[PDB]
């Protein structure tokens, strides 16, 4: 039975080794030293900086680092390889080697103890030497919050970051809109956001009735009964933000909720796109904003791909306004659990995740 | 059983319905009307290039729902779209990117043997879309029997059809490594059937097995360890003696005849060969490099690696008029001929607008 996050428990099940050569090892060692049991004999985390590998021949560096240590990696352990964005390498030799990283981290998992995970994080070569924009990703990965995120690839760009005042309350003071919020993952996302100190606007359909009122109260948020596919949805959300939150939201989570071709397109693709375009277009979501999509056969497979489309298409335009857009694509859930999906969303929602945009991650 | 390609037998086993709306539907009609039976369905092509908004995706369902049930066995479904990173609006990017979800799930409601493919075409492709044609012909045929759910990315460049679509590789000189047996030997065979002159390479100890491949295909044998330092030179020397110093196509497979080892054989050697043969003028204008992965940490890395080669080298190779693509096979022995066909599709002189692609065969 897998480790999920709690309280003032330590982030890892044991010590944390950071190795490799490159531009990430020192900044990370300095950044993670206070909160993690850092080393120079039973490991909770293994981090290899692969940024210094500039040719395929150098790929043996991976083998040389992990082989002596993998076996001593604990249950529910973390392995992270950090490389540089291959599209942006300085030589074709470097692009090949950094691309090859993905193969290594995704097959290593089959050698690991139960519940242990692996992850690949790419960092812009244009990120500044302190690598602040990387921190929220590492903390998410090196913690129990990321229990069911495995074999994934995270792409961090170039901007600097600022830690939240408190990494145990990273969403402290933020306003989050969550749709499909009465039951299911939606209700859980709302709960995890509140735990992290956000004020949640819980949105669902009018027939959710009391259930929605219930979620709002449990999370200390507010309820907004509304059909997100109606013409006036943007306007109604804005009005609610004017009354309860001085006209502004920080986070929009587009979750369809469980509460024909055209109905599926309208709910899982058209509506969330409209919501995003409108709430951004009118300034309700401004600098520091976070949009996070959550997918979930020909109907749905198209809207799931559509959601990936939104996330990639809107990222450039949105980054120029200081806003990130990301998505989570969950697997088999009712094994994997909702809290797990919610953590991933909360990781993107982080004010310290400003250098994470255009990403799509699978959970379970 | 599942149908593969033979004789002057017609390419589909039913008629071809090309519908939809956009920049590809007319030119594709005019291109295929002679060889195919146009408008109990052998093939279904939907032009999705005119969908510039997500709301328009309803046209996919509108087109497909009446006709899928009438699609014959081993039918081909192909959706053609516009390269999403190059669309003119975010709305368009989103609608074109969504075609991928539709194309992958559609396969699941098809008959056995029937396939689905998504083709993206550069919006700077001329109206005739001649660069599109070899991809279309490969897909609308028995040759692609086990290429399902895949995404092809076709560039802006025009194409010239080969003299004969049945001998597409006529007069071409193809280097095939690891050719003594397995896929290497079958690749050699499909290449010769398509008219190529094959240089069959493999290690010393394949001995007479290499001789038989070279012999079966009307080619030549080169006994060589492709990880040895002299490898580029010996190959060049061979090309000088037998082909006037040029090869057209290079197939990177070294087949079937400890971390360090897997890397040399599977990532380093095929990179060396590619860089050596292009850099010494052995492969030029019109060249074709095609990588083939293995069928597991060291192999996983070299398989990711191959994708890297394929993506990294493509821009610089395009400027030299050389394409690079790869096939990721297995689990197999499905059949070898099916992988070889995929390699032959990339090899084709008419696939010049096809580069930086990675296709799984299953």
Number of H helices, E strands in chain A: 11, 12
Residue A302 to residue B105, Cβ atoms within 8 A: yes
d(CA B342, CA B246): 23
d(CA A309, CA A265): 14
Q: How far is CA A210 from the centre of its chain?
A: 30
Q: Are B185 and B213 in contact (CB under 8 A)?
A: yes
Strand residues in A3-88 grouped as ranges (E): 15-20, 43-49, 73-84
Chain B residues with CB under 8 Å of A261 CB are 58, 61
* CATH, range A1-158: 3.40.50.720
d(CA A101, CA B234): 32
Encode A123-157: b = buried (16+ Cβ within 10 Å), e = exposed: bbeebeeebbbbbbbbbbbbbbbbbbbbbbbbbbb
CA distances from B258 to A20, B51, B177, B228, B298 (A): 21, 51, 21, 17, 9
Chain B residues with CB under 8 Å of A306 CB are 54, 57, 94-95, 97-98, 101
Angle at A347 between CA A346 and CA A350, to 5 degrees: 85
Exposed / middle / buried, residue A1 (Cβ in 10 Å: 0-12, 13-18, 19+)? exposed
CA-based torsion, B168, B171, B175, B181: positive or negative: positive
Report which secondary-structure segment, H or E, holds A290.
Answer: strand A289-294
Listed in sequence order, the residues at least 6 apart from B304 whose beta carbon sits closer than 8 Å to its beta carbon are A99, A100, A101, A102, A103, A104, A106
Active-site hit among A36, A122, A148, A300 = A300
Listed in sequence order, the residues at least 6 apart from B334 whose beta carbon sits closer than 8 Å to its beta carbon are B146, B361, B362
Listed in sequence order, the residues at least 6 apart from B136 whose beta carbon sits closer than 8 Å to its beta carbon are B28, B31, B32, B45, B78, B119
d(CA B7, CA B15): 19
> Got the DSSP string for B211-268?
HHHHHHTT-EEEE--TTSTTHHHHHHHHHHHHSTT--SEEEE------HHHHHIIIII
Q: Are B107 and A318 in contact (CB under 8 A)?
A: no
Coil/strand/helix, residue A173: coil
Q: Are B255 and B180 in contact (CB under 8 A)?
A: yes
Task: Give chain B's largest Cα–Cα span.
Answer: 62
- For B212, other C-beta atoms within 10 Å of its C-beta total 16
Q: Are B282 and B245 in contact (CB under 8 A)?
A: yes
d(CA A60, CA B298): 9
The shortest CB-CB distance from B105 to any of A99, A104, A297 is to A297
Angle at B136 between CA B131 and CA B142, to 5 degrees: 145
Listed in sequence order, the residues at least 6 apart from B171 whose beta carbon sits closer than 8 Å to its beta carbon are B195, B197
Encode A311-333: b = buried (16+ Cβ within 10 Å), e = exposed: bbbbbeebbeeebbbbbbbbeeb
The shortest CB-CB distance from A103 to any of B60, B108, B305 is to B305
Report which secondary-structure segment, H or E, holds B191.
Answer: helix B183-193
Exposed / middle / buried, residue B74 (Cβ in 10 Å: 0-12, 13-18, 19+)? buried
Q: B269-279 vs B231-242: helix axis angle to the nearest 10?
A: 50
Instruction: Give the number of C-alpha atoms closer than 13 A to the C-alpha of residue A103, restricted to the C-beta side.
Output: 25
Residue B296 to residue A110, Cβ atoms within 8 A: yes
Chain B residue nearest residue A108, CA to CA = B297
d(CA A63, CA B58): 49
Q: Are A246 and A284 in contact (CB under 8 A)?
A: no
Chain B residues with CB under 8 Å of A101 CB are 304
> Got the DSSP string for A231-254?
TTHHHHHHHHHHHHHTT--SEEEE
Q: Are B229 and B204 in contact (CB under 8 A)?
A: no
Find the DSSP H helices in B113-173. 133-139
Give the residue numbers of the binding site of A for NADH: 182-183, 185, 204, 227-228, 255, 257, 304, 333
The owner of tokens 């600097």 is: A160
Tell me which DSSP letter residue B129 carries: -
- For B38, other C-beta atoms within 10 Å of its C-beta total 14
Coil/strand/helix, residue B199: strand
The CATH fold assigned to A159-364 is Rossmann fold (3.40.50)
The shortest CB-CB distance from B297 to any of A108, A298, A313 is to A108
Instruction: Put residue A28 in one of left, alpha, beta given phi > 0 → left and psi -120 to 50 → alpha.
Output: alpha
- For A226, other C-beta atoms within 10 Å of its C-beta total 18
Exposed / middle / buried, residue A335 (Cβ in 10 Å: 0-12, 13-18, 19+)? exposed
Listed in sequence order, the residues at least 6 apart from A323 whose beta carbon sits closer than 8 Å to its beta carbon are A280, A285, A286, A287, A288, A289, A290, A291
The shortest CB-CB distance from B101 to any of A100, A270, A302 is to A302
Give a three-class secondary structure readout of B261-330. Answer: HHHHHHHHHHHHHHHHHHHCCCCCCCCEEEEECCCCHHHHHHHHHHHHHHHHHHHHHHCCCCEEEEEECC
The owner of tokens 């994470």 is: A356
The owner of tokens 């109260």 is: A217
Domain limits of chain B? 1-156, 157-362
d(CA A33, CA A24): 14
φ and ψ at B223, to 5 degrees? -85, 115
Listed in sequence order, the residues at least 6 apart from A334 whose beta carbon sits closer than 8 Å to its beta carbon are none
Chain A residue nearest residue B93, CA to CA = A313
d(CA A47, CA A142): 9
d(CA B235, CA B245): 10
- For B8, other C-beta atoms within 10 Å of its C-beta total 5
Chain A residues with CB under 8 Å of B303 CB are 103
Tokens of A79: 């392995």
Q: Are A203 and A178 in contact (CB under 8 A)?
A: yes
The shortest CB-CB distance from A104 to any of B58, B93, B300 is to B300
Chain A residues with CB under 8 Å of B308 CB are 56, 86, 95-100
Listed in sequence order, the residues at least 6 apart from A179 whose beta carbon sits closer than 8 Å to its beta carbon are A186, A203, A204, A228, A253, A254, A255, A256, A257, A272, A275
Q: Are A329 and A360 in contact (CB under 8 A)?
A: yes
d(CA A105, CA B304): 10
Tell me which DSSP letter residue B155 carries: -
d(CA B115, CA B110): 8
Whether A300 is catalytic is yes
* CATH, range B1-156: 3.40.50.720
d(CA A86, CA A98): 6
Exposed / middle / buried, residue B89 (Cβ in 10 Å: 0-12, 13-18, 19+)? exposed
Angle at A298 between CA A297 and CA A300, to 5 degrees: 65
d(CA A270, CA A264): 9
Coil/strand/helix, residue B336: helix
Residues of B (260-319) whose Cβ lies below 8 Å from A: 260, 263, 267-268, 271, 296-305, 307-309, 311-313, 316
Name the method of structure determination: X-ray
d(CA B12, CA B326): 26
Chain A residues with CB under 8 Å of B93 CB are 309, 312-313
What order do you get walking across the sheet with B288-292 strand by strand?
B220-223, B197-202, B173-176, B249-252, B288-292, B323-328, B358-360
Q: How far is CA A279 from the centre of its chain?
A: 21
Listed in sequence order, the residues at least 6 apart from B202 whose beta carbon sits closer than 8 Å to its beta carbon are B177, B178, B179, B180, B184, B209, B210, B213, B222, B223, B224, B254, B255, B257
Residue B303 to residue A261, Cβ atoms within 8 A: no
Q: After what residue numbers is chain A broken, C–N > 2.5 angstroms? A: 40, 259, 296, 334
The owner of tokens 């600022």 is: A162
Tell me which DSSP letter residue B111 carries: P
Pick the CATH number of B157-362 from 3.40.50.720, 3.40.630.10, 1.10.3720.10, 3.60.110.10: 3.40.50.720
Residue A97 to residue B313, Cβ atoms within 8 A: no
d(CA A181, CA A205): 9
Strands A175-178 and A199-204: parallel
The answer to whether A86 faces chain B, any CB pair under 8 Å, is: yes
CA-based torsion, B33, B39, B41, B44: positive or negative: positive
> Got the DSSP string for A207-219?
GGHHHHHHHHHHT
Tokens of A177: 């809109």
Tokens of A142: 């090196």
CA distances from A309 to A288, B54, B289 (A): 22, 10, 31
Q: Are B80 and B43 in contact (CB under 8 A)?
A: no
Choosing among A270, A306, A319, which should be mutated to test the B contact, i.e. which has the most B CBs within 10 A?
A306
Q: Are B284 and B246 in contact (CB under 8 A)?
A: yes
Coil/strand/helix, residue A329: strand
The answer to whether B93 faces chain A, any CB pair under 8 Å, is: yes
φ and ψ at B357, to 5 degrees? -95, 145
Chain A residues with CB under 8 Å of B297 CB are 63, 104, 107-108, 111
Exposed / middle / buried, residue B40 (Cβ in 10 Å: 0-12, 13-18, 19+)? exposed
CA distances from A84 to A88, A126, A156, A319 (A): 8, 10, 9, 20
Residues of B (53-72) whose Cβ lies below 8 Å from A: 54-55, 57-58, 60-61
Give the residue numbers of the binding site of A for NAD(+): 183, 185, 204, 227-228, 255, 300, 304
């Amino acid at each position: 039975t897998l480790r999920r996050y709690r309280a003032g428990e330590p982030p890892l099940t044991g010590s944390l080794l950071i190795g490799g050569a490159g531009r990430v090892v020192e900044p990370l060692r300095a950044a993670l030293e206070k909160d993690y049991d850092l080393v120079g004999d039973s490991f909770g985390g293994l981090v290899f900086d692969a940024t210094g590998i500039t040719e395929p021949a150098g790929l043996k560096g991976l083998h040389e680092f992990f082989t002596p240590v993998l076996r001593n990696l604990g249950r529910c352990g973390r392995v992270v390889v950090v490389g540089g964005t291959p599209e942006a390498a300085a030589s074709t030799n470097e692009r090949i080697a950094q691309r090859a990283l993905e193969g290594f981290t995704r097959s290593l998992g089959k050698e690991l103890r139960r519940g242990a995970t692996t992850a690949l994080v790419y960092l812009s070569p244009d990120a500044k030497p302190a690598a602040t924009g990387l921190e929220s990703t590492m903390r998410f990965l090196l913690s129990a919050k990321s229990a069911y995120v495995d074999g994934q690839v995270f792409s961090v760009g170039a901007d600097d970051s600022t830690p939240p005042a408190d990494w145990e309350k990273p969403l402290d003071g933020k306003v989050a809109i969550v749709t499909g919020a009465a039951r299911g993952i939606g209700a859980t996302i709302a709960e995890v956001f509140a735990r992290d100190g956000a004020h949640v606007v819980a949105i669902d359909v009018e027939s959710a009735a009391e259930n929605l009122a219930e979620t709002a109260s449990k999370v200390g948020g507010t309820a907004l009964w509304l059909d997100v596919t109606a013409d006036d949805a943007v306007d109604k959300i804005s009005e609610h933000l004017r009354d309860h939150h001085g006209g502004k939201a920080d986070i929009l989570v587009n979750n369809a909720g469980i509460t024909r071709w055209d109905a599926v397109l309208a709910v899982n693709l058209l509506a969330p796109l409209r919501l995003t375009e409108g709430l951004v277009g009118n300034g309700s979501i401004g600098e520091g904003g976070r949009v996070i999509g959550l997918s979930s056969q020909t109907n749905y497979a198209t809207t799931k791909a559509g959601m990936i489309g939104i996330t990639q298409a809107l990222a450039p335009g949105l980054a120029a306004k200081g806003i990130t857009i990301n998505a989570v694509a969950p697997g088999f859930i009712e094994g994997g659990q909702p809290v797990d999906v919610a953590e991933a969303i909360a990781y993107f929602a982080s004010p310290a995740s400003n250098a994470v945009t255009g990403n799509v991650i699978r959970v379970c």
